[PDB]
Each structure stands twice: as structure tokens, then as C-alpha cells.
Design a protein around this ligand. Structure first.
Ligand SMILES: CCCCCCCCCCCCCCCC(=O)O
Lengths: 253, 267, 54, 107, 237, 119
């Protein structure tokens, strides 16, 4: 039976009874940095159980007219346990991820969600002379939401959250070139993505740069008949893999 | 580079189901037409040679053109080097997140005669200088300046009426690849400049006339051409749907995903 | 001197004249394809004739 | 700036009647529109947002229709809980401008 | 002084020539190369990835997510048509902006087979059977299910495996086809018809949706690179 | 969850500055912004300003100079100030939160503080 999985990382375990396959990045599994690719000369820290475990964010509610949500991935885990504590004391860090999006509904519901993972998702602003602010690019483990309409310009340097351009100026149907899965409520219950470390440098500062972005977009809207449960949540659970840190100094933020 | 060829097939009645799959796995089906219908054996001599990245990207493309006039003390041109002011090469490089290439640089310099008032203008042949200043060096402030002495900065001289000047540039970077997209800030307090302008530091190009203003003004124009060689590319990216607005960022105005038709069965 | 194969539907020769490897000609005959990292980025290998879920 | 014209000023209907209240803008707001209901001397309540979407606790008798510069609300079957003032507001760009108001009678 | 003689084509700038050039920075030490995941060597590795097709333009759905949703109901008749479009993968406005069609608009000629995957995004208690047909040119577009079953068709049974592939074979008189609209190298039509009805139980919604994906086979190739018509400019940025 | 409420001086003299403080609960000020709307008897509803979730403001063009809104995220309280208080300022002032699922519409309103500017 291909329908069951079990993922164990640290002191946490994920159990799934109805799933698709597991998507592994670009075919690469996350591993540690080698000696011929390293730059910094001091010894890196490897906590290996206090950081590499499953953290669960807040839950969002899927509605009949909902548009989509997104997260910035080395920013939602910035107050999460000892993963966020090692980010504040160190200057460099590299990390791969295991993302588990989960959403259950009955055989009487329908809908379809696309779960992509976009690297270097640089977004646009509503005022064309400015760039968006940090508070509207990312929340602290809280989803920022796409809109079904076009956002106008103001003094808040907002993101153009028209969902069909995906905040980047592209076609939203062409988002399947990134590592992705679907959650079809007819057949699927969860989605699992394992991402390696993707950058143009072997290590990078984990506060001034978000090199991954998790988008969840309902291509087919949620629908049910009267009598079925109206409240359907979506829960995201992310686990760091092979996280190491370098450049220990006093605590930022 | 030859493409895969076609296998013959026979009528089947079995429990093998190549047509039925599950697209929720994030997996593209590897089906050929010899699984769903009866085909014949076909030898294919087609090649995938012209769609490689060394063929798709290695063509000369205009990136800028600047102008400077002879009869002026401020008559020189200046350009901060980037690849985000023209629409055609920007859309080609932004199909990938990371790139790494050597560069071939070509200049096309022309001139035009401005409406003077002297009698019997007879001008000699013009000579131009194109000087490259890396970030941190001294910059010229007028045409007759000490900064054009080019002791260590690379420069090129060229006389009108000849082949265009051309030279190669290796992979100059502080990182391991060029970045077309940057999702971050230049400061640790997350203020100020956001985006790809924080990683752009490539230098400035300066252009001038080496001859003096003889008896009439002459206004020249230099065109710059980029040609990437020995290319490597990672992490493909969807093509740009909207139109570009600015140079420093990826701001846009929303637009529909296709154009309209009148009905779903309209052919 | 290097003698190569000259793409056709015959050989040609080539000598490098400069000291830097950024000065050479374009490659143009490096033909490698690996679409399995984009089309099949999965953990368990799926056979084409078998059902995807079981 | 941009002004929202609300029509009509007042209505007189009965229980079981369909009510149509419209709003018009000076220029296009791109369906950046909201609707509010105000009872006697209290705070307003959000009822329909984004020119089609219904609010959290709002029942399915209300309906939002419109695009461009013309928008409308429809109430299918009236109840005793629905009379009061109805406003329309755009949130396209500052300055945000409310509608003039429309009151229901239920005679 | 070796006696030489300069040929025509000297001191010219052809933008696609392959020569050597002297370096401006001699003995420059580049940074070492890293192993970054996801290296692309060929543009055909991109075009074999599925991309969602907006079949439902209908002049009001293009600035929405409704363009990718194909409506499917429960009918009181039989033999009805679901959708239909011509097979012009780089000229027809349905497949023009997909990830396959955006690479095709950089080239002039194309050749090979085309995959079409359809996903049933309905309720798990709903059933149905569809006819996915492709007809070569020479006649018009088929008006009935009887005219459409005479060509290349697959009958899709909706079950636990919620996807089916209609593989459009390469049937042409030439070796390549033009990407631009040309009546000499037309490719045919792709239609969809109701084989049976969508039978649904009580307290389940009658209306469902269908997603559609397009990609290329391993016999696909392109030729004669050109510049795309999907970008414009008036002045510098 | 539960929502916000406000506190006010009630009634002051003409040409005197006004200070009404909205104290929020159930949500954080780093995720949502606060709007200031004025229900007038003769002029209906009118929008005075907004303090955005990043900390930047936006004011009405009729009331730009006299109006200023600040906040402090740790105390979960919003403070705005209006000056010179003419006779047409007699109205009911509300504080209401926006960003209703990203759609910039007012979600939940305060209880209101009716003011009177006469002697
Ligand atoms: C006469 C001397 C000429 C020297 C000119 C050197 C020009 C440097 C060009 C740098 C290449 C930049 C490539 C694009 C980088 C990016 O995509 O951010």
C-alpha cells in the first residue's frame, strides 16, 4: 500500500493514512556542507535534534471564496524553539526543509489546492515607484493572503496580491515548474515536499534573506452542500534538515 | 542529441493502464503514443541541438545606447552597468534564477554632424575612448581630466571607419553565480533597498571623444552588446507575463493570463 | 591543434591563441539532457504501466 | 478625488419582497467595494466585501453584484432583522469615501 | 610578410558569429564552482513539465482563477460537448501562454507529440465517463459525438485514479510545423464529449470542475530561434 | 475571540485638542491596521485616517495637518490627536480594524465615543 507514510525527525512523528508520493526537491536530498565548498574557517555548530524537528504554524481557514496564502520560510521559524534562538546568535546558516501541508475533508466535499515552493520569490508593490515593506511581505508564522481583486496604491507599501499573477508578474498556471504537489479532496489528504539548500552562496544570513516561499493556492474552490461541516482548516508543519550555523556573536533582534 | 524514436504496437487487452495516472503526485506522465494506439516503427533523425543553453543564450543583444556631444566641457557619457533596461535580454536571462557565464562585449559607435555656422567644415577622422572604472576607483568629472590616464583601469581606443571593438570578460563575481532575483535586503534591520539592486555592483562605463572640437560640433552614439559564453544555469523560472515598468525592481500592473475567446467550444 | 566533428545532416580544426580560457569560442556541441529531476522529482519510482496509487 | 453615489435615498418594502440598492463611482475601483449595515444608534456591521463576498456571520439572503463603476446589492427575502441604513464604501485608494446612505421602512 | 587576401565579409559584425577575442582582465581568478540543485542544459527539459491550461477564457475569466476551471454538470440529455479548441500550440490563445507555448514562441518550427492530462477535481462520490478526441485536419471541427469518435479518442472512466492522458500523435505531411498561424500546416482539433452522465448522490453538489495540463513527449524538438512577440518597450527603464 | 474598545474625554471647549484612545484585544497590531471613521449627522460617515500595520500613516486631505495617529505595539493601544476643533466636529468617532482577509475593509468596530464641541 502506497497510501501510508511515516516521517520521524527528532522527537516528533508525522502519520499519514492517505497521501500521494513524496516530492524531493530537484532530486537532491539535504546534506551537510563539504570541505571543498566551505568558505568560513571556524567550526560550525550542529544541534541535530533541537533544531531538526517538526514545528507547526498557525492554521488558516479554507472558505468558498478564498484566494490563497503564503509564507516566507526562514522567517516563520524565527521564534520557534531553539531553531529561532540559533538564528539570533549566529551570523551564517544553511538549512534544508521538510514541508507537510495537511487538510482533511469528507467524501462529500470537493476542492483542489496547489502547494508550490518557490525559491527567491521577489514580489512587487502596488505603488510602482516603491518596494514593499517587511511587515506586508512576511508575518511571524502567520499567513499573508492573496486577493481576488487588484490592490490600489497608498502610503502602505503593499504587495500586489492579485492571485492570478501570484505576486510576481507571471502566469499562475506556470507555477508547476517549481517542486509542487496537489491536494485534491477527492483523493488526497496531505502533501509532502523535501527541499535542499538552494542559493548562490554556501552560507547566508538567515534574517536579511528569505530563499524559500511556500504558496498554497486553491485552483478549484471549496464546495459542499448544506449539512456538511462548514469549517475546513489547513495546517502547515515544517521541519529543518541538516541545519548548521556559523559566526557566533551577541544576539540580534 | 537525437530524439527518441517510435516503437510499433499491437492491439492489447490487459490490466496495464498507462493512460490512467494521478497528477496530484507532482509527477509528469512518461507515456508515448505507442501505449494508447497502434503505431508504426519510425526512425527519428531530429536533434535537440538548437535548444541547448549554449545556443539559446549566446547571441549578441543590445543593452544600452548613450550619447555625448563634442563641443561641450561636460560632453562625456556615463552608464552604470546592468542588464535590466532593455526588455528582450531581461526576459531571456530571467527564465533562470542563477546563471554563470563569460561575456563578450561589442561596441557600435556612430556620429552625426550638428548645425554649425562656420564656412567649409572639413573634419578629420574621429577617435573615441571607452573607459571602464571598477567600483571604488576615481571617476571623471570633465572631458579634459586627469582620470582618463588609465594606468590600471582597462580602456579601449577606436578610430571611426573600422571594425567594431570587441573584448572578452571572465566570470566576475563575489558569489558562485549571478543572481537574477534576490528576495532580501541590504541591511540587517530590514529597511531601505529591497531586491536585486543590493547585489548589483559591476562598475561604470565612460565614453568620450579623444579629438578636440575643431570647427563644428559632432554628436556621437555608442551601442553596447552583450553575448554570454560558457553558460551554466540553475533553477528554471516561469516567463514574464506582465510588462516591465522599472529597472530596480519587479513591480508590475496586473493583466489577464491569456486573451479572450467567445465560447469554450469555439474553434 | 584540435580536430572536431562539424555538425551536419567532415572535420574542422581549431587552435587557441590567447592565454585565458575566457577567450575561447562558444561550446555549442555539449548536448546533455537530464529531465528526470524536473519531470520525476519523486521519492518512490513509479512504473508507467502500474497504477499510481495502491 | 472619487465620490460614491448611492441610490435611492429611501425605500418602503414588505416582508418577502426583493430589494435592490445600487452604488455608482466616479471612476473604476476594480471591485474594491464594501457594504455596511447600521441599526438604531449603534456601530456599523460589515456585510458584503470585495463586491461579491459575504461576511462571517451574514446569512445567504444578501448578494453582491457589480464590476467597474456599477454595483448592486440584493436582498431576497426580508426579515425583521434587516431594516436600517445601508452604506457602500470603496477602499481602492485614499481618500476612502462612504456612500450617502439608504434606509429601509418595512411598512 | 606573408601574402594574404581579405575576402568579402571582413570588418563586419554578425551577431551570431563564433570567434575568439582578447581578454580585458588577464589572469583573473574566478570563484570556484558550486553544486547548486536544478541545473538546466536544454530548454526541452522545461517543456516536458505539465502546465495548467486556461481553456475557459470566455472574455470575463481571464483576470481570475476561473480561466483554468472547466465546468461539468449533470445533464438531462446525452452527447453534449464539454470544450474544444484548435491544436495550435504557439498561435492559438488557449495554449499560447502555457509553459510549452512560451518556449515555442522563441522558435519558428516545431515537431513531435503532445500530452494532455485531465484531472477530475470533483467529489469522491461522483462518477462519470468522458470522450477525449483528436481529429486531424481536412474536414471541419466535429459537431457531434458521432463525428468525433471517428478520429483518435480515449474513453476516460473516473475512479480512484483521477487523471487520464490523451496523447496527440504526430500526424503531419512534413517533418516540422510552423509555430505561427498558417493554413498549410494546420494540426487539427481537440474536443471533449459526455460519454455517460455525471451521476451524483443526495447532499452532494451537482457541479464539478476539471483541470487540464499540457506538456511535450520525448520526440519533441524545436528549430530556428527568433525573438518573442510577448514583450514590448518604448523607452529605457 | 474578543475585540477592541475605546475611551474618550466626552466633551471639551472649542479650539481644544481631542485625544481618544483605542485599546485592542484578541489580535496584535503588527498584523492589522486601525481606521478612524467619523459618523456625522449632517455629513454621514467620513474616513479620517489609518495607521497601517507597518507603522506608516495616511490622512484625509481635508484634515491632514491637524490630525496625527501613533501607536505602540507592546501596550496594544492606539493614540490619535486632532486640533482646533471647529463647530462641525460634533459627531461620533469610531476605531475599527482593517485587513479583513487582506481586503482592507473594516472588520470589527468600537463602541463609539460621541463628542460635543460647544460651550
Ligand atoms: C574596455 C573595458 C570593458 C570592461 C567592461 C566590463 C563589464 C562587466 C559586465 C559584468 C557582467 C554582468 C552580468 C549580469 C549580472 C546580473 O545578472 O546581475
Amino acid at each position: 500500500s502506497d497510501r501510508v507514510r511515516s516521517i520521524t525527525l527528532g522527537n516528533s512523528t508525522i502519520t499519514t493514512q492517505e497521501c500521494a508520493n513524496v516530492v524531493v526537491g530537484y532530486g537532491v536530498w539535504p546534506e551537510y556542507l563539504k570541505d571543498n565548498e566551505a568558505t568560513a574557517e571556524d567550526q560550525p555548530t550542529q544541534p541535530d535534534v533541537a533544531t531538526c524537528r517538526f514545528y507547526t504554524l498557525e492554521s488558516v481557514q479554507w472558505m468558498k471564496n478564498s484566494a490563497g496564502w503564503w509564507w516566507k520560510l526562514p522567517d516563520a521559524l524565527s521564534q520557534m524553539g531553539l531553531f529561532g534562538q540559533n538564528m539570533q546568535y549566529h551570523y551564517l546558516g544553511r538549512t534544508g526543509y521538510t514541508i507537510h501541508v495537511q487538510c482533511n475533508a469528507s467524501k462529500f466535499h470537493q476542492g483542489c489546492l496547489l502547494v508550490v515552493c518557490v525559491p527567491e520569490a521577489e514580489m512587487g508593490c502596488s505603488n510602482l515607484n516603491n518596494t514593499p515593506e517587511f511587515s506586508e511581505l512576511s508575518g511571524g508564522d502567520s499567513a499573508r493572503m492573496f486577493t481576488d481583486t487588484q490592490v490600489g496604491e497608498s502610503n502602505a507599501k503593499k504587495v500586489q496580491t492579485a492571485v492570478w499573477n501570484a505576486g510576481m508578474g507571471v502566469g499562475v498556471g506556470n507555477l508547476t515548474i517549481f517542486p509542487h504537489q496537489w491536494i485534491n479532496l477527492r483523493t488526497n489528504n496531505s502533501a509532502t515536499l523535501v527541499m535542499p539548500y538552494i542559493n548562490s552562496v554556501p552560507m547566508d544570513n538567515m534574517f536579511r534573506h528569505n530563499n524559500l516561499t511556500l504558496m498554497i493556492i486553491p485552483f478549484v474552490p471549496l464546495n459542499y452542500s448544506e449539512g456538511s461541516s462548514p469549517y475546513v482548516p489547513i495546517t502547515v508543519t515544517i521541519a529543518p534538515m541538516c541545519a548548521e550555523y556559523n559566526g557566533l556573536r551577541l544576539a540580534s533582534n | 542529441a537525437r530524439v527518441a524514436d517510435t516503437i510499433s504496437s499491437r492491439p492489447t487487452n490487459s490490466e496495464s493502464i498507462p493512460a490512467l495516472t494521478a497528477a496530484e503526485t507532482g509527477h509528469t506522465s512518461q507515456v508515448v503514443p505507442s501505449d494508447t494506439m497502434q503505431t508504426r516503427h519510425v526512425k527519428n533523425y531530429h536533434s535537440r541541438s538548437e535548444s541547448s543553453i549554449e545556443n539559446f543564450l549566446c547571441r549578441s543583444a543590445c543593452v544600452y545606447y548613450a550619447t555625448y556631444t563634442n563641443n561641450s566641457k561636460k560632453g562625456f557619457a556615463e552608464w552604470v552597468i546592468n542588464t535590466r533596461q532593455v526588455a528582450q535580454l531581461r526576459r531571456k536571462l530571467e527564465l533562470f534564477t542563477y546563471l554563470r557565464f563569460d561575456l563578450e562585449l561589442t561596441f557600435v559607435i556612430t556620429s552625426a554632424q550638428q548645425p554649425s555656422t562656420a564656412s567649409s567644415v572639413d573634419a578629420p577622422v574621429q577617435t573615441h575612448q571607452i573607459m571602464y572604472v571598477p567600483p571604488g576607483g576615481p571617476v571623471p568629472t570633465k572631458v579634459k581630466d586627469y582620470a582618463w590616464q588609465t594606468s590600471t583601469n582597462p580602456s579601449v581606443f577606436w578610430t571611426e571607419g573600422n571594425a567594431p571593438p570587441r573584448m572578452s570578460i571572465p566570470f566576475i563575481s563575489i558569489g558562485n553565480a549571478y543572481s537574477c532575483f534576490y528576495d532580501g535586503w541590504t541591511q540587517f534591520s530590514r529597511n531601505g533597498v529591497y531586491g536585486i539592486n543590493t547585489l548589483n555592483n559591476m562598475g561604470t562605463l565612460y565614453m568620450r571623444h579623444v579629438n578636440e572640437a575643431g570647427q563644428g560640433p559632432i554628436k556621437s552614439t555608442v551601442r553596447i552588446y552583450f553575448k554570454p559564453k560558457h553558460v551554466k544555469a540553475w533553477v528554471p523560472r516561469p516567463p514574464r507575463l506582465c510588462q516591465y515598468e522599472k529597472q530596480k525592481n519587479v513591480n508590475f500592473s496586473p493583466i489577464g493570463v491569456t486573451t479572450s475567446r467567445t465560447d469554450i467550444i469555439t474553434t | 591543434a584540435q580536430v572536431s566533428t562539424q555538425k551536419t545532416g567532415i572535420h574542422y580544426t581549431n587552435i587557441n591563441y590567447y592565454k585565458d580560457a575566457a577567450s575561447n569560442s562558444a561550446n555549442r556541441q555539449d548536448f546533455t539532457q537530464d529531465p528526470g529531476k524536473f519531470t520525476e522529482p519523486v521519492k518512490d519510482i513509479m512504473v508507467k504501466t502500474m497504477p499510481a496509487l495502491n | 478625488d472619487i465620490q460614491m453615489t448611492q441610490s435611492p435615498a429611501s425605500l418602503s418594502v414588505s416582508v418577502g419582497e426583493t430589494v435592490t440598492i445600487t452604488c455608482r463611482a466616479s471612476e473604476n475601483v476594480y471591485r474594491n467595494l464594501a457594504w455596511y449595515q447600521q441599526k438604531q444608534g449603534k456601530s456599523p456591521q460589515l456585510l458584503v466585501y470585495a463586491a461579491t463576498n459575504l461576511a462571517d456571520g451574514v446569512p445567504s439572503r444578501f448578494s453582491g453584484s457589480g464590476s467597474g463603476t456599477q454595483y448592486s446589492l440584493k436582498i431576497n427575502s426580508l426579515q425583521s432583522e434587516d431594516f436600517g441604513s445601508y452604506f457602500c464604501q470603496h477602499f481602492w485608494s485614499p481618500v476612502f469615501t462612504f456612500g450617502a446612505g439608504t434606509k429601509l421602512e418595512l411598512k | 610578410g606573408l601574402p594574404v587576401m581579405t575576402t568579402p565579409g571582413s570588418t563586419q559584425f554578425l551577431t551570431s558569429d563564433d570567434f575568439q577575442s582578447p581578454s580585458a582582465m588577464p589572469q583573473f581568478d574566478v570563484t570556484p564552482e558550486m553544486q547548486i540543485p536544478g541545473r538546466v542544459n536544454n530548454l526541452m527539459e522545461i517543456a516536458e513539465v505539465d502546465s495548467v491550461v486556461p481553456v475557459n477564457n470566455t472574455e470575463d475569466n481571464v483576470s481570475s482563477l476561473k480561466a483554468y476551471q472547466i465546468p461539468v454538470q449533470s445533464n438531462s440529455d446525452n452527447g453534449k460537448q464539454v470544450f474544444g479548441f484548435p491544436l495550435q500550440p504557439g498561435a492559438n490563445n488557449v495554449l499560447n501562454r502555457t509553459l510549452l507555448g512560451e518556449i515555442l514562441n522563441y522558435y519558428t518550427h516545431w515537431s513531435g507529440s503532445i500530452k494532455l492530462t485531465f484531472m477530475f477535481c470533483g467529489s469522491a462520490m461522483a462518477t462519470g465517463k468522458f470522450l477525449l478526441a483528436y481529429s486531424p485536419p481536412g474536414a471541419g471541427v466535429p459537431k457531434n459525438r458521432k463525428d468525433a469518435m471517428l478520429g483518435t479518442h480515449v474513453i476516460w472512466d473516473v475512479g480512484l485514479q483521477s487523471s487520464c492522458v490523451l496523447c496527440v500523435p504526430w500526424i503531419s505531411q512534413t517533418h516540422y510545423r510552423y509555430v505561427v498561424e498558417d493554413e498549410y500546416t494546420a494540426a487539427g482539433y481537440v474536443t471533449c464529449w459526455y460519454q455517460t452522465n455525471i451521476v451524483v448522490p443526495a447532499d452532494v453538489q451537482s457541479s464539478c470542475d476539471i483541470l487540464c495540463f499540457v506538456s511535450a513527449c520525448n520526440d519533441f524538438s524545436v528549430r530556428m530561434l527568433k525573438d518573442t512577440p510577448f514583450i514590448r518597450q518604448d523607452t529605457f527603464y | 475571540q474578543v475585540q477592541l474598545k475605546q475611551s474618550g474625554p466626552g466633551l471639551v471647549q472649542p479650539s481644544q485638542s481631542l485625544s481618544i484612545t483605542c485599546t485592542v484585544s484578541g489580535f496584535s497590531l503588527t498584523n492589522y491596521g486601525v481606521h478612524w471613521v467619523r459618523q456625522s449627522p449632517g455629513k454621514g460617515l467620513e474616513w479620517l485616517g489609518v495607521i497601517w500595520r507597518g507603522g506608516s500613516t495616511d490622512y484625509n486631505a481635508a484634515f491632514m495637518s491637524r490630525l496625527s495617529i501613533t501607536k505602540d505595539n507592546s501596550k496594544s493601544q492606539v493614540f490619535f490627536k486632532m486640533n482646533s476643533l471647529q463647530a462641525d466636529d460634533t459627531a461620533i468617532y469610531y476605531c475599527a480594524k482593517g485587513d479583513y482577509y487582506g481586503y482592507d475593509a473594516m472588520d470589527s468596530w468600537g463602541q463609539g465615543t460621541s463628542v460635543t464641541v460647544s460651550r
